[PDB]
């Protein structure tokens, strides 16, 4: 079988000779917990609800419904509203329901009970039970009646159900609605990179882990980690996302002062050759050496680790997210030229990076790296080996972006910054083994 | 204030249809003339003969009607556009035959509103550019060259024929009077000049604030070839090109992607969002159009807000045609379609009579516009009186009943009159919605009939969902639209809902219902369709005197 | 100890490709800082570097082990704006070809965002870092000032017939010849500048062909560069095989057929 | 069989564009004329002057191009339609300016194929009706009166003007010759007459079986007002009306709903299915169009199956225009758009030269059409030889490189030549797909460039996804389309994929690629656009000699 050594975010060894299956999404209790956490946890913007009601700006986007203001102050009653929400959504005493006031009353962290997920088919019960509980709590707290409660309901739920989503509403998730899935099994792929950077508190090693875990959880749900492809995906998860054998950490550290995309390429090849993952195959008349992969899935995993380390060294040096698109492209383009072996995901990282570069530097769509995700038409094409790098680049940015994590995902930071699986994902995954 | 007169508003149209007829007669002689009585049917039959001969295949033929009868065993009657002298044949109000109707929809579908503040913040933050009135002026020139489909950066570009895209343009608007006055007026929607009644301009400027917005209208020919999903994308493409030229940016650098995300999403205000899979549609299609937005597109409110009924019924005319004839009668079905399900709401001054009667009743019982109690008791009183009165009109005037020959038409008009009266009286759209369903229920028990087989799905779900706050039931009327679940299927409601959404804000003497950006955008007289007098435009289209955009005569042979 | 080999091929064009990749490119001319800054058009010569965010030392950074072991470039430490240089290169044997400009940047420079297209190649980086990378490229044998030029917009010309005097077509004519020297008197987005940047003499035709990385019929014929064709084939084949199944057995799967190579 | 000539197929167009020019010269004199060199740009400038005067607002103005230069600092060159004598200005091939291109797409979008067997089974089972040639004949008359928008059951119906909907019609077709022979031929697609070559008619009839289908084409004007989602609904409504009349049903009983479900869903064959939210679109839009269906709409295969290259390149012309110019260049973006990204594939006989060269190479090395080994080694040989030859052509003829001035154009044409050669040689679409990506990889290393910033997203994903069998990666090429994930964004690929899908079935001497129902439906000469000679139709549109449907001259003023 395959074994890996597990290392934490500071390159300290956690556990040795861990069975690769023990970090599988299907087996590792910490990964299972992380999935459950992002499914059932939502944030409530009580300040946004208060503002929408007081200014009758239901639905957002400069909407104003003259005369239909409702003068309520939920941020001043946040503890009372939080207690009612908890009572309304909790299934059993002592269950895993949590409702916590944050920001002095401006926001609510709502971990809906896992039973409400279990009792449904999808993941939206957290969003919907919270929106409903909050609507009821506001109605009761402010003695609302027949003809004003509908407006307050739109302050919570946005333009739902005229729209399929809670557009302009004030119940937030790091997931999107299921109807936005591009295909089968894509819900865990639909996590905005800005969100991922905030989940990790801009710790780039933890961001790699959180993003890689959730991406490969998606790939398993898509049915693209079956049989031989399970080993293929699990090695990529372990080496790119879980700092297996400390390879990502060490390659980044040894190239952090003077290194470049190209020096990380060279280090990856040298490590593959030294470790026996690749060998010289034939030599051309010029002296150029064609390599061969002795372990094909492992060669991919080394390329995945190198792609990530290259992202950390190049975006780290720039302190800018935008270079991630070219890093992913040219790390893999040049490792192929260096070896005559295919690069990460056999060209699918390079290809993702070509279009991602285009749609982060052109008029046609996309945006800065922070708006992409594994469900985005531009960045969906690798099975999990591109987006973790994008999230890391977003975390490393020191302030070059228009739509930064702080502007789109501030509430995500506050909601999850005390959640152990997000504070130390690598230690949690190792401890679960 | 308004005083309801002695002669019913619908009598003129009856006398113009039936010169010399005693309007109390319940009986009539049938001559069973068939189609030859009607000039339009005769013209259609001859058109069908040409069609069949030119293509070698049978097409239109009145004699294919079943039963060995052609249309017109009874008298085929024409339609008067309400408040207009124009009387037209019914076929002239079919949307396929009526270019004013087609262009009203094209004008909405090809519109997107796009903020400029985020783009300007990008230029400052990422490039360190200074945004001045002079740089904005250069941008506005660039965008009005490029948006119709012309080139500004590359070499050896091929372009759209300017004459085919002559309706495409971009104007800016802002609550900041100092900036608005610094830009050449051809590029600016002048809020102060267009909204000079009842201080509406100051309400709009306060609600928009010192923010800058672009009203973008892409070419009609494009949305005709393509769909409403084209609009926000096309707009964003040429916005991006214009920023590249106007600020000397790299023609494709990371910051351009930020401009694209702003123009396409972060600062984009669509007229309508997408729809679910069973009725899958791109954005900017009628199913996604909210009633608040539909009411804000209609501009009679800025012309004569002192008569809230007139604006209300112009919104009814706008919405009933769009939602019933084009959306439900074509997008969601097709064929002969649903012309008269909608014409009942904007012809022969019937709804006008019923609604002005209600307005007068409410003015004398409850007081002035917008001051009646916002409660179920008040909705009950107004809806019941307005509905009874209208039913008595249909009962006392046999040719009025004959005009609204389908129960669904009568249901929609009686309920609209009821809900518009309530909205004007209370100033509250949600209370008016209670009155709408009240009318339906009263009507049903009076005559032991209401509408077509599936007319009152939403009406029997109706009263209980007015004041629900549950996830897929609760919603303020302004934000409801043609995808609100109960409303997603059936004729004879959606445009009326838009109408009395307008009626509530007209009764409150507001400047708009739901979005001030929509309101300013559609006031602009540079649009092809005149959104300030819907029924007059429909008359033009029916009389073949409305010139639409998007024709291809410049590039086709004779 | 791993020795990079960069790229296959034995022709002098492949040798030039490995030179560009490895950074072993000869300096052929000097461009002063003030001249380059004027050409790039992002700030006045002599002006302070504008900022997009405060210096890192002033605002501090999140607690991140990667930030703590990856050294910021000077421009990143300073908070510079991310700016760019962009070049277009003639297909008539310009020394540079777009992808190898991007490999040069990606191998030899830190914190860079290179982009490859057919008619333009861009390097985005923090402004002062961008300037250093552009100076290195523009002063080197990677650049002929007739067959290549700074073009931040309106780039048409890489695939066009050269003008009669050897200059690549530029719709904005940002450069022109004066007495045998290429003069640049507009910045890279076509704005006239108050100076004449003298970029020196163009490459002769023979020099361009000695220094070029492009394969074409009037130089090193691509068809004869078997090692490169072998490399392309091998990478395509292995991509194809492993997409089917990522294992050695896929390399002889039904459907592969009698794949064969010229030099291995 | 075919012999490749000694003169390159593209030389004629070069000589017609550059009278007297030495085609080997690498340098040219630039005279920097600007737009006044070109009649079409001068016409556009004058058109923009009228637009601006008429509406009070600046529009098109060549002088707004940045840099103080107008288009045409180099020579602006025209385009020869491949295999045609017609040379046109490039703007004449912009889809907005070209009614033939618009009508080709409208003809696709307004088409739905609907089975009749389920409906006949319903009438038998639920009503005990007997379905005969005589009852079917009565139905076909009913449906050709009702489908354009005319009434058959109710009284006082208003109808579409038959001249506005003259392009709307329904025909039936069937593998059962006995039935096809009993129905008036004006109502029948004659499979035996249209598919007389190479036994194609017997292949189609065997694939369809003794089943009966309707080819429904709703009015162009309707899909222009609305969208492609209108098509199956409009069809079903009038199919339903026609069954009610032709079988004396209750006009609205439970059995009618069974006919509705059959017409809308259970027996309905859409041209294209819906798309995900990011690019939400109704059915019957280009993103949902599979390459197999696109190839099967083109009819050159029934005209001259003995020259597989001609049909292949007509498919390329159909697909590149639709997918790049209309779909990607408008629905998914807009503006000036993507005319020349597509024209490279259907003008100046360039792709023709590269592809006939490959065809001759394959014939001499591997043997006749369709007999080459279906393997990666064969894809490698053909793609490398065809790509190298084409690159050498661009290198040896400077004005050819100048024609395909963008690398994206060169990449698509070199790869299309490679994959079309491989498809014709091997008769296998999937092997041809390996050849397509091989060409890209060979090209990139030769010139150190390929396409635009984002051109080879799908191509770097490409080789590994040809033979993947994973959920969202694996797929045979015939069933891939413009929503296959890797393909969902970028120019220069989709129409070429359709082309060499066709090439593989042309090489195999099949009668169709993917669906025989589509094949028969679009062979019908009653469509407005001639699907049997795409590039000839494009020339007519570019010369303003193509008459499209859907115009409104009958109901507008002048
Ligand atoms: C076949 C149906 C069942 C169905 O699914 N739709 C039908 C027919 C359909 C067809 C009729 C076209 C034709 O005549 O060929 C169209 C035009 C839709 C289309 N396919 O284009 C239509 N009805 Ni219907 N349908 C209407 C109506 C109605 C009224 C008419 C009652 C009366 O006393 O005349 C009744 C329902 C009711 O009783 O409430 C009705 C029923 C019916 N409606 C019965 C036919 C009734 C009959 O046998 O005569 N429609 C109306 O109530 C007014 C608007 C009118 C629509 C056309 C327009 O809006 O101009 C038309 C809307
Ligand atoms: C601003 C961008 C970045 C972006 O997102 N899109 C642009 C511009 C956009 C605009 C240009 C319209 C105008 O001039 O105002 C349009 C027409 C799309 C639109 N908005 O309608 C377009 N490109 Ni572009 N674009 C093209 C192309 C190209 C080629 C041109 C290279 C050359 O040597 O001329 C290069 C990419 C490359 O190098 O591979 C290119 C880049 C670019 N393209 C650079 C501008 C380059 C410059 O500064 O000159 N396009 C082409 O390669 C051919 C097709 C051509 C398209 C028009 C058509 O198909 O007819 C047009 C397609
Ligand atoms: C990426 C995506 O854009 P967003 O990132 O969602 O704004 C998508 N556009 C496109 O794919 C544009 C493709 C056509 C223009 C570029 C052709 S290469 C769309 O609008 O749905
Ligand atoms: O008769 S039904 O009510 O089914 C249809 C009315 S148009
Ligand atoms: O320059 S880009 O490749 O972004 C667009 C080409 S149209
Ligand atoms: Cl397996
Ligand atoms: Cl292996
Ligand atoms: Cl010259
Ligand atoms: K349309
Ligand atoms: Kr959240
Ligand atoms: Kr008409
Ligand atoms: Kr042109
Ligand atoms: Kr914008
Ligand atoms: Kr809309
Ligand atoms: Kr009133
Ligand atoms: Kr009743
Ligand atoms: Kr310079
Ligand atoms: Kr030509
Ligand atoms: Kr034209
Ligand atoms: Kr009629
Ligand atoms: Kr049917
Ligand atoms: Kr389609
Ligand atoms: Kr191949
Ligand atoms: Kr062949
Ligand atoms: Kr390359
Ligand atoms: Mg008053
Ligand atoms: Mg010569
Ligand atoms: Mg033959
Ligand atoms: Na050889």
DSSP chain C: -PPP------SHHHHHHHHHHHT---B-----HHHHHHHHTSS-TTPPPPBSS--HHHH-----TTTTTSPPPHHHHHTBPEEEEEEEE-TTT-S--HHHHHHHHHHH-SS-EEEE-SS-EEEEEEHHHHHHHHHHHHHBTT--TTTEEE-SS----TTSPEETTSPPP-TT--EEEETTEEEEEE-TTS-EEEEEEE--PPPPHHHHHHH-----TTSS-GGG-HHHHHHHHHHHHHHHHHHH-SSGGGGG-TT--S---S--
Cα–Cα dist C261/A282, whole Å: 11
The two structure tokens encoding residue B163: 């004459």
Kindly list the residues from chain A whose CB atom is less than 8 angstroms away from the CB atom of residue D278: 180, 182, 376-377
Residue in this structure with the two tokens 């030549």, named with its chain if needed: D417
Bridge partners of C177, per DSSP, are C182
Interface check for D185 against chain B (CB to CB < 8 A): the answer is no
Cα–Cα dist A359/B252, whole Å: 10
Cα–Cα dist D117/D122, whole Å: 9
Kindly list the residues from chain D whose CB atom is less than 8 angstroms away from the CB atom of residue B156: 71, 74, 76-77, 90, 340, 405
Distance B546 CA to ligand 3 centre (A): 36
- Across the interface, do C71 and A257 touch by the CB < 8 Å criterion? yes
Resolution of this entry, Å = 1.8
Nearest to A385 by CA among A248, A261, A240: A240
Nearest to A60 by CA among A175, A125, A144, A155: A155
DSSP D330: I
Cα–Cα dist A199/A373, whole Å: 14
- Across the interface, do B47 and D186 touch by the CB < 8 Å criterion? no
DSSP D503: H
Residue in this structure with the two tokens 């004598």, named with its chain if needed: D85
What phi and psi values does residue D268 have, to the nearest 5 degrees?
A: -100, 135
Nearest to D147 by CA among B213, B335, A313, A225: B335
CB A37 within 8 A of CB A45: no
- Count of CB atoms situated within 10 Å of the CB of D367: 12
For the Cβ of D92 lying below 6 angstroms from any atom of ligand 19, the answer is: yes
Cα–Cα dist D96/B349, whole Å: 42
Contacts of C among chains (3+ CB pairs under 8 A): A, B, D
CB C246 within 8 A of CB A228: yes
D341 is an active site residue: yes
Residue in this structure with the two tokens 């290198």, named with its chain if needed: D395
Nearest to C155 by CA among C131, C178, C174: C174
Bridge partners of C87, per DSSP, are C121, C150
**Residue positions of A annotated with a catalytic role:** 364
The single residue of D54, D154, D469, D471 carrying the catalytic annotation is D154
Kindly list the residues from chain C whose CB atom is less than 8 angstroms away from the CB atom of residue A315: 111
Which of D60, D154, D232, D261 would you mutate first to test chain B, the one with the most B CBs within 10 A?
D60
Nearest to A176 by CA among A162, A164, A190: A190
Residue C260 C-beta-side C-alpha neighbours within 13 Å: 4
- Across the interface, do D405 and C159 touch by the CB < 8 Å criterion? yes
How far is C-alpha B230 from the geometric centre of its chain's CA atoms? 20
CA dist B163 → B187, B549, D556 (Å):
20, 10, 17
The residue of chain D with its CA nearest to that of B343 is D158
Pairing relationship of beta strands A41-45 and A107-111 according to DSSP bridges: antiparallel
Bridge partners of B171, per DSSP, are B215
The two structure tokens encoding residue D189: 């697609």
CA dist C183 → C141, C180, C196, D148 (Å):
18, 9, 6, 68
What phi and psi values does residue A111 have, to the nearest 5 degrees?
A: -95, 100
Contacts of B among chains (3+ CB pairs under 8 A): A, C, D
Cα–Cα dist B522/B42, whole Å: 39
Nearest to B115 by CA among A140, D184, A311, A60: A60
For the Cβ of B453 lying below 6 angstroms from any atom of ligand 4, the answer is: yes
Cα–Cα dist B475/B481, whole Å: 10
Ion ligand 8: residues, CB within 5 A, are C 163-164; D 29-30
- Across the interface, do B430 and A58 touch by the CB < 8 Å criterion? no
Pairing relationship of beta strands D87-88 and D212-217 according to DSSP bridges: unpaired
**Residue positions of B annotated with a catalytic role:** 154, 341, 454, 490
For the Cβ of B286 lying below 6 angstroms from any atom of ligand 14, the answer is: yes
Distance C169 CA to ligand 8 centre (A): 8
CB D231 within 8 A of CB D268: no
CA angle D341, D345, D349 (to 5 degrees): 135
C-alpha torsion angle, residues C135, C140, C144, C150 (rounded to 10):
-20
CB A421 within 8 A of CB A274: no
For the Cβ of A173 lying below 6 angstroms from any atom of ligand 10, the answer is: yes
Pairing relationship of beta strands B111-115 and B268-269 according to DSSP bridges: antiparallel
CB A349 within 8 A of CB A386: yes
Kindly list the residues from chain C whose CB atom is less than 8 angstroms away from the CB atom of residue A342: 235, 238-239, 242
Cα–Cα dist A333/A348, whole Å: 11
Q: Whose CA is nearest to atom 1 of ligand 13?
A: B263
Cα–Cα dist D330/B213, whole Å: 24
CA dist D110 → B189, D38, D101, D283, D316 (Å):
38, 37, 14, 11, 22
Number of residues written out for chain B: 558
Range 17-36 of D in CB contact (< 8 A) with A: none
How far is C-alpha D112 from the geometric centre of its chain's CA atoms? 16
With residue B355 as reference, give the H or E element that holds it.
Answer: helix B350-365
Cis amide prior to A62 (ω within 30 degrees): no
- Contact partners, residue D366, CB within 8 Å, separation at least 6: D372, D373, D378, D425
From the CA of D47, which ligand is nearest? 19
The two structure tokens encoding residue A402: 């228009």
Handedness of CA A35, A40, A46, A50 (dihedral sign): positive
Handedness of CA B532, B534, B539, B545 (dihedral sign): positive
Q: Whose CA is nearest to atom 1 of ligand 12?
A: B156
DSSP D130: P
CB D364 within 8 A of CB D133: no
Residue in this structure with the two tokens 């003639």, named with its chain if needed: C90
Pairing relationship of beta strands C121-126 and C113-116 according to DSSP bridges: antiparallel
Residue D195 C-beta-side C-alpha neighbours within 13 Å: 26
Q: Identify how the structure was determined.
A: X-ray
Name the burial class of residue A221, with classes exposed (0-12), middle (13-18) and buried (19+) by CB atoms within 10 angstroms of its CB.
middle
Distance D516 CA to ligand 24 centre (A): 24
- Across the interface, do B162 and D51 touch by the CB < 8 Å criterion? yes
- Across the interface, do A337 and C109 touch by the CB < 8 Å criterion? no
The two structure tokens encoding residue B258: 């930020």
Cα–Cα dist A131/A128, whole Å: 5
The two structure tokens encoding residue B282: 């791109």
Pairing relationship of beta strands C162-163 and D27-28 according to DSSP bridges: parallel
- Across the interface, do B474 and A153 touch by the CB < 8 Å criterion? yes
Interface check for A316 against chain C (CB to CB < 8 A): the answer is yes
How far is C-alpha D260 from the geometric centre of its chain's CA atoms? 30
Cα–Cα dist C114/C129, whole Å: 13
D154 is an active site residue: yes
Nearest to B416 by CA among B327, B320, B543, B322: B320
Kindly list the residues from chain B whose CB atom is less than 8 angstroms away from the CB atom of residue C86: 250
Q: Whose CA is nearest to atom 1 of ligand 20?
A: D156
- Across the interface, do A367 and B515 touch by the CB < 8 Å criterion? no
Cα–Cα dist D315/D310, whole Å: 9
- Across the interface, do D453 and A358 touch by the CB < 8 Å criterion? yes
- Contact partners, residue D515, CB within 8 Å, separation at least 6: D269, D292, D293, D296
Residue in this structure with the two tokens 């009993």, named with its chain if needed: D182
CB nearest C64 (choices: A202, A288, A289): A202
DSSP A112: -
- Count of CB atoms situated within 10 Å of the CB of D272: 23
Measured in angstroms, the CA of C87 and the nearest CA of chain B are apart by 11
Q: By three-state DSSP, how is residue D556 classified?
A: coil
From the CA of D92, which ligand is nearest? 19
Q: Whose CA is nearest to atom 6 of ligand 4?
A: B452
Nearest to B517 by CA among B171, B231, B119: B171
Cα–Cα dist B234/B255, whole Å: 19
The residue of chain B with its CA nearest to that of A178 is B276
Contacts of A among chains (3+ CB pairs under 8 A): B, C, D
Cα–Cα dist B397/D251, whole Å: 30
- b/e burial code for range B451-479 (CB count within 10 A of at least 16 → b): bbeebbbbbebbbebbbbbebebbbbbbb
Nearest to D333 by CA among B230, A180, B57, C48: B230
CB B341 within 8 A of CB B406: yes
How far is C-alpha A24 from the geometric centre of its chain's CA atoms? 17
Cα–Cα dist B506/B502, whole Å: 6
Cα–Cα dist D320/D327, whole Å: 10
Lining ligand 22 with CB less than 6 A are: D 108-109, 271-272, 284-286, 289
């Amino acid at each position: 079988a395959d074994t890996i050594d597990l290392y934490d975010d500071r390159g300290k060894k956690l556990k040795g000779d861990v069975d690769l299956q023990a970090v599988s999404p299907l087996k590792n209790s910490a990964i299972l917990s992380m999935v459950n956490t992002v499914k059932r946890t939502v944030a409530v913007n009580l300040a946004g609800i208060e503002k929408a009601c007081k200014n009758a700006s239901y639905g957002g986007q400069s909407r104003n419904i003259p005369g239909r203001e409702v003068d309520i102050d939920p941020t001043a009653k946040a503890d009372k509203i939080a207690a009612r929400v908890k009572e309304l959504i909790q299934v059993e005493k002592g269950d895993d329901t949590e409702v916590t006031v944050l920001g002095g009353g401006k926001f609510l962290r709502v971990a809906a009970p896992t039973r409400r997920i279990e009792a449904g088919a999808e993941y939206v019960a957290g969003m919907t039970c919270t929106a409903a509980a909050l609507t009821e709590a506001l109605r009761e707290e402010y003695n609302l009646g027949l003809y004003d409660t509908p407006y307050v309901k739109n302050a919570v739920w946005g333009t739902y159900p005229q729209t399929m989503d809670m557009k302009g509403g004030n119940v937030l998730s790091v997931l999107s609605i299921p109807q936005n899935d591009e295909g089968l099994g894509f819900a865990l792929r639909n996590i905005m990179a800005n969100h991922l950077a905030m989940l990790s508190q801009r710790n780039a090693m933890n961001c790699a882990a959180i993003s890689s875990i959730l991406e490969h959880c998606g790939v398993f749900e898509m049915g693209q980690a079956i049989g031989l492809f399970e080993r293929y995906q699990l090695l990529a998860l372990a080496y790119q996302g879980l700092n297996a054998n400390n390879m990502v950490y060490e390659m980044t550290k040894n190239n952090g002062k003077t290194g470049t995309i190209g020096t990380v390429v060279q280090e990856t090849v040298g490590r593959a050759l030294d470790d026996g993952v690749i060998s010289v195959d034939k030599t051309m008349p010029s002296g150029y050496k064609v390599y061969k992969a002795n372990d094909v899935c492992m060669w991919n995993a080394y390329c995945a680790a190198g792609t990530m380390a290259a992202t950390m060294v190049n975006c780290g040096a720039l302190r800018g997210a935008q270079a991630v698109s070219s890093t992913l492209l040219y790390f893999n383009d040049m490792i192929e030229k260096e070896t005559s072996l295919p690069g990460c995901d056999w060209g699918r990282v390079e290809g993702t990076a070509v279009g991602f570069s285009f749609f982060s530097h052109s008029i046609y769509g996309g945006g800065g790296p922070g708006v992409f995700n594994g469900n985005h038409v531009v960045t969906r094409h690798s099975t999990g080996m591109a987006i973790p790098c994008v999230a890391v680049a977003v975390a490393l940015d020191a302030g070059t972006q228009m739509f930064s994590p702080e502007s789109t995902s501030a509430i995500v930071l506050d909601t999850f910054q005390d959640v152990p699986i997000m504070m130390n994902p690598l230690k949690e995954v190792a401890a679960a083994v | 204030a308004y005083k309801y007169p002695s002669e019913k508003l619908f009598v003129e149209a009856l006398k113009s249809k039936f010169a010399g007829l005693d309007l109390s007669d319940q009986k009539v002689k049938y001559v069973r003339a068939g189609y030859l009585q009607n000039a339009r049917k005769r013209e259609f039959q001859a058109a069908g003969e040409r069609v069949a001969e030119q293509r070698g295949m049978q097409q239109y033929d009145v004699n294919v009607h079943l039963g060995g009868m052609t249309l017109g065993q009874r008298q085929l009657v024409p339609y008067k556009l309400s408040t207009r002298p124009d009387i037209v044949e019914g076929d002239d109000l079919h949307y396929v035959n009526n270019p004013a109707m087609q262009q009203m929809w094209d004008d909405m579908k090809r519109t997107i509103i796009v903020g400029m503040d985020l783009a300007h913040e990008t230029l400052e933050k990422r490039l360190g550019k200074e945004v001045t009135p002079e740089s904005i002026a250069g941008y506005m020139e660039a965008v009005n060259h490029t948006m119709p489909g012309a080139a500004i950066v590359q070499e050896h570009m091929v372009e759209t024929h300017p004459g085919l895209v002559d309706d495409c343009y971009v104007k800016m608007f802002t609550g900041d009077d100092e900036l608005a006055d610094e830009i050449d007026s051809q590029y600016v929607i002048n809020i102060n000049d267009l909204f000079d009644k009842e201080g509406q301009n100051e309400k709009l400027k306060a609600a928009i604030g010192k923010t800058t917005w672009q009203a973008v209208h892409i070419p009609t020919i494009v949305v005709r070839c393509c769909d409403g999903g084209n609009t926000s994308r096309w707009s964003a493409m040429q916005i991006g090109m214009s920023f590249i030229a106007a600020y000397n940016m790299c023609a494709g650098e990371a910051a351009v992607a930020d401009l694209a995300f702003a123009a396409k999403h972060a600062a984009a205000v669509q007229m309508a969002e997408m729809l679910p899979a069973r009725r899958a549609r791109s954005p900017n299609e009628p199913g996604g159009l909210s009633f608040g937005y539909c009411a804000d597109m209609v501009q009679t409110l800025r012309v004569k807000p002192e008569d809230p009924v007139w604006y209300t019924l112009e919104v009814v005319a706008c919405g009933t045609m769009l939602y019933d004839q084009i959306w439900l009668g074509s997008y969601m079905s097709g064929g002969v379609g649903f012309t008269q399900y909608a014409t009942a709401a904007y012809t022969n001054d019937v709804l006008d009579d019923f609604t002005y009667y209600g307005y007068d009743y409410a003015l004398n019982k409850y007081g002035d516009d917008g001051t009646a109690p916002n409660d179920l008791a008040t909705a009950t009183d107004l809806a019941t009186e307005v509905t009874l009165n209208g039913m008595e009109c249909y009962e006392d005037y046999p040719t009025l009943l004959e005009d609204h020959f389908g129960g669904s038409q009568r249901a929609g008009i009686l309920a609209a009159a009821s809900a518009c009266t309530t909205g004007i009286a209370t100033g509250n759209s949600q209370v008016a919605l209670s009155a709408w369903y009240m009318s339906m229920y009263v009507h049903k028990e009076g005559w032991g009939r209401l509408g077509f087989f599936g007319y009152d799905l939403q009406d029997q779900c109706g009263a209980t969902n007015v004041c629900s706050y549950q996830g897929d039931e609760g919603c303020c009327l302004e934000l409801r639209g043609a995808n609100y679940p109960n409303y997603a299927m059936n004729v004879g409601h959606q445009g009326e809902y838009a109408g009395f959404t307008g009626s509530a804000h007209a009764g409150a003497h507001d400047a708009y219902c739901c979005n001030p950006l929509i309101k300013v955008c559609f006031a602009d007289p540079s649009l092809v369709f005149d959104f300030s007098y819907i029924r007059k435009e429909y008359a033009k289209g029916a009389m073949r005197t409305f010139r639409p955009a998007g024709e291809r005569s410049l590039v086709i042979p004779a | 100890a791993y020795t990079p080999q960069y790229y296959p091929g034995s022709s002098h064009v492949a040798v030039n490709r490995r030179k560009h990749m490895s950074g072993d490119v000869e300096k052929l001319r000097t461009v002063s800082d003030d001249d380059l800054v004027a050409a790039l058009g992002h700030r006045a010569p002599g002006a302070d570097y504008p900022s997009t965010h405060p210096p890192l030392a002033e605002m501090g950074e999140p607690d991140c082990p990667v930030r703590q072991m990856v050294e910021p470039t000077p421009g990143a430490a300073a908070g510079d704006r991310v700016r760019y240089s962009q070049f277009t290169d003639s297909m008539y044997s310009a020394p540079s070809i777009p992808y190898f400009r991007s490999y040069y940047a990606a191998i030899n420079f830190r914190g860079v965002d290179p982009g490859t297209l057919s008619g333009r190649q861009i390097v985005e980086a923090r402004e002062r870092d961008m300037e250093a990378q552009c100076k290195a490229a523009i002063e080197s044998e990677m650049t002929c000032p007739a067959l290549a030029g700074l073009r931040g917009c309106t780039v048409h010309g890489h695939s066009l017939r050269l003008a009669e005097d050897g200059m690549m077509f530029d719709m904005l004519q940002r450069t022109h010849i004066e007495g045998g020297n290429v003069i640049e008197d507009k910045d890279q987005v076509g704005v006239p500048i108050d100076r004449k940047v003298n970029l020196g003499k163009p490459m002769s035709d023979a020099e361009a062909k000695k220094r070029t990385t492009i394969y074409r019929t009037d130089g090193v014929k691509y068809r004869d560069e078997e090692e490169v064709l072998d490399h392309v084939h091998l990478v395509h084949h292995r991509r194809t095989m492993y997409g089917y199944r990522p294992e050695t057995a896929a390399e002889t799967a039904p459907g592969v057929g009698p794949v064969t190579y010229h030099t291995v």
